[PDB]
Design a protein around this ligand. Structure first.
Ligand SMILES: CCCCCCCCCCCCCC(=O)SCCNC(=O)CCNC(=O)[C@H](O)C(C)(C)COP(=O)(O)OP(=O)(O)OC[C@H]1O[C@@H](n2cnc3c(N)ncnc32)[C@H](O)[C@@H]1OP(=O)(O)O
Ligand SMILES: Cc1c(NS(=O)(=O)c2c(Cl)cc(-c3ccnc(N4CCNCC4)c3)cc2Cl)c(CC(C)C)nn1C
Length: 390
């Protein structure tokens, strides 16, 4: 496929459209602590909830810094709406630039994320106005395509992936209302079921060091080449998205571990996961759930069997152990990548959550999301989604 429409830079308006009475546009400068705080204060209380919520995403200020100021970031693409009188931030839509591969065609796109409207300004119909504005600010910088992720079904989706959840602290998930008691079982037997070993198994497993950047960049891109829709990682993107800088970063957000074969001594494997907290609304016992999310990963055994199934089962179980020691409660993953190989065997529970992938101004054939028609993981429905959006 290809682009749907060609944009004339000559017809892109210098000024933005009109907003609701009493509200004005604002470019967020996330280099300043006050403005980063303002966005955090908005999202913590007004961002993605579940239906019964219960739960709401608590993206940390260290996460927001990490997700919105990646290589090539422009402040223009951190769009906010302020109340004219009070100066309070009441809405947001954000974007960062990246390259994605859509069926071998390379594309300049913006990753659209953190769409948020204050609860008091709900519909209203403010979303299309927020979409049009960040679209205009992209059009002025020479970006006419977008990739975005949404848990709601919208016009013409590219793919659909189901959420999966591995309990590291089952009692915690049970007490907050996330994990049920199925069916004629006790609490203790569910905890005994989710018991993990204390030590990692994979030979030569260690945290990723900045020396591993070039080698991880090559391995990851060769692995992502196996997917129809994937992120064309640059060296700086590998550095930013995959190596934690504790200098610098006081509240760790990303985790990366590598192997590091005892004989090569070239690296043959790597996996990663990030820190995204969720607030429990009706507190009682707990008020916070710490969740780890499977990020990017690769392995040399893929380029062959199915020994890839065997290898990922060892690596991802190791990732669960390392997540537990890092005090995470649940390990989240989607049916994207080669995940339908290890998910069910490693005691990941089928989730109610569904994540849909979309493209703006780019027509392409439907891409498999790792699930069959029953929404169950399928080995034959992989090789599609190779991009993880935060
Ligand atoms: C080249 C540059 C292009 C870049 C742009 C690419 C496009 C990217 C688009 C942005 C992708 C962002 C990716 C993420 O960040 S996904 C996360 C979205 N955020 C949340 O879920 C946070 C909690 N929710 C809210 O704050 C609000 O409920 C939101 C803001 C979602 C809607 O506020 P409200 O409830 O007050 O609704 P409205 O009256 O203003 O407007 C109603 C319209 O909004 C459309 N809607 C609903 N949900 C979503 C959604 N998740 N993605 C896109 N659109 C959505 C819907 O079709 C409806 O249109 P229509 O069916 O009536 O016709
Ligand atoms: C709804 C929710 C859950 N449950 S869940 O099944 O894992 C889940 C569910 Cl139901 C829905 C989403 C969800 C919904 C809508 N959009 C998104 N995306 C928005 C764009 N960025 C990626 C996430 C995710 C994400 C998750 Cl992680 C959780 C994890 C619990 C273990 C606390 N937190 N929250 C706020």
């Amino acid at each position: 496929g290809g682009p749907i429409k060609i944009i004339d830079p000559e017809k892109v308006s210098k000024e933005p459209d009109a907003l609701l009475e009493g509200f004005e546009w604002a470019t967020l400068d996330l280099t300043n602590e006050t403005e980063l705080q303002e966005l955090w204060d908005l999202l913590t209380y007004h961002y993605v909830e579940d239906d019964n919520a219960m739960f709401r995403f608590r993206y940390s200020q260290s996460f927001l810094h990490w997700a919105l100021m990646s290589p090539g970031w422009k402040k223009e693409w951190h769009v906010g709406v302020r109340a004219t009188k009070s100066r309070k931030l009441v809405a947001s839509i954000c974007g960062v630039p990246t390259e994605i591969n859509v069926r071998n065609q390379k594309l300049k796109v913006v990753e659209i994320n953190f769409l948020c409207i204050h609860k008091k300004l709900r519909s209203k119909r403010l979303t299309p106005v927020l979409i049009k504005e960040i679209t205009r600010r992209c059009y002025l910088n020479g970006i006419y395509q977008a990739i975005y992720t949404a848990g709601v079904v919208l016009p013409t989706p590219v793919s659909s992936c189901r959420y999966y959840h591995r309990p590291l602290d089952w009692l915690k998930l049970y007490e907050v209302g996330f994990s049920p008691l199925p069916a004629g079982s006790t609490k203790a037997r569910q905890i005994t079921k989710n018991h993990l070993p204390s030590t990692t198994s994979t030979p030569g497993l260690r945290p990723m060091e900045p020396k591993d950047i070039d080698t991880v960049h090559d391995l990851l891109q060769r692995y992502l080449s196996r997917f129809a829709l994937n992120q064309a990682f640059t060296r700086e993107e590998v550095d930013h998205w995959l190596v934690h800088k504790p200098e610098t970063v006081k509240e760790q957000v990303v985790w990366a571990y590598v192997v590091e074969d005892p004989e090569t001594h070239k690296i043959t494997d790597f996996f990663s996961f990030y820190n995204l907290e969720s607030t429990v609304i009706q507190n009682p016992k707990h008020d916070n759930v710490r969740a780890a999310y499977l990020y990017y990963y690769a392995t040399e055994t893929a380029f062959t069997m199915k020994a890839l199934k065997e290898r990922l089962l060892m690596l991802m179980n190791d990732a669960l152990i390392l997540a537990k020691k890092a005090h995470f409660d649940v390990f989240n993953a989607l049916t994207l990548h080669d995940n339908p190989l290890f998910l069910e065997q490693l005691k990941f529970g089928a989730g109610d959550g569904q994540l849909h992938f979309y493209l703006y101004n780019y027509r392409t054939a439907p891409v498999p999301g790792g699930v069959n028609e029953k929404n169950l993981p399928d080995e034959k429905r992989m090789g599609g989604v190779g991009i993880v959006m935060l």
